Motif scaffolding. Structure first.
Motif, PDB file in Angstrom:
ATOM      1  N   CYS A  50       0.826  -1.211   0.000  1.00 18.45           N
ATOM      2  CA  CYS A  50       0.000   0.000   0.000  1.00 18.45           C
ATOM      3  C   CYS A  50       0.861   1.262   0.000  1.00 18.45           C
ATOM      4  N   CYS A  53      -0.126   3.091   3.968  1.00 16.12           N
ATOM      5  CA  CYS A  53       0.307   2.472   5.229  1.00 16.12           C
ATOM      6  C   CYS A  53       1.610   1.689   5.063  1.00 16.12           C
ATOM      7  N   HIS A  70      -6.784  -5.903   2.585  1.00  8.54           N
ATOM      8  CA  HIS A  70      -6.263  -4.631   3.071  1.00  8.54           C
ATOM      9  C   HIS A  70      -6.801  -4.336   4.469  1.00  8.54           C
ATOM     10  N   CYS A  77      -5.028   1.636   8.361  1.00  7.44           N
ATOM     11  CA  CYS A  77      -4.627   2.428   7.198  1.00  7.44           C
ATOM     12  C   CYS A  77      -5.591   3.579   6.908  1.00  7.44           C
TER      13      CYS A  77
HETATM   14 ZN    ZN Z   1      -2.932   0.818   3.429  1.00  9.12          ZN
END
Ligand code: ZN
Length: 98
Positions: A50, A53, A70, A77
């Motif tokens: 990602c 994050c 995710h 995140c």
């Molecule tokens: Zn993330």
């Protein structure tokens, strides 16, 4: 783990940049889904991370949903939260086990 407002890799905030890394992609999960969910491919097996994050994911299985994974692995995140919301993150955790 980054739960700050500042993306870990701001240079991958750019959608074109993320999608570039999926120029080819031999793995089951759809690359547009992966990109929208904030991931870009490292170029090593099916590893993605990602942009926000910095959360990495790998060993994808058929049917797996990029937004779900995710939320399962990186619920803190901020990008995930902005897109999916708290209800979704929490429900992922009420229906999934790590
Ligand atoms: Zn993330």
């Amino acid at each position: 783990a980054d739960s700050h407002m500042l993306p870990r890799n701001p240079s991958m905030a750019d959608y074109e940049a993320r999608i570039f890394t999926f120029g080819t992609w031999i793995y089951s999960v759809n690359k547009e889904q992966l990109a929208r969910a904030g991931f870009y491919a490292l170029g090593e097996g099916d590893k993605v991370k990602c942009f926000h994050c910095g959360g990495g994911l790998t060993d994808w299985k058929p049917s797996e949903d990029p937004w779900e994974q995710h939320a399962k692995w990186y619920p803190g995140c901020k990008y995930l939260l902005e897109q999916k919301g708290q209800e979704y993150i929490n429900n992922i955790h009420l229906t999934h086990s790590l």
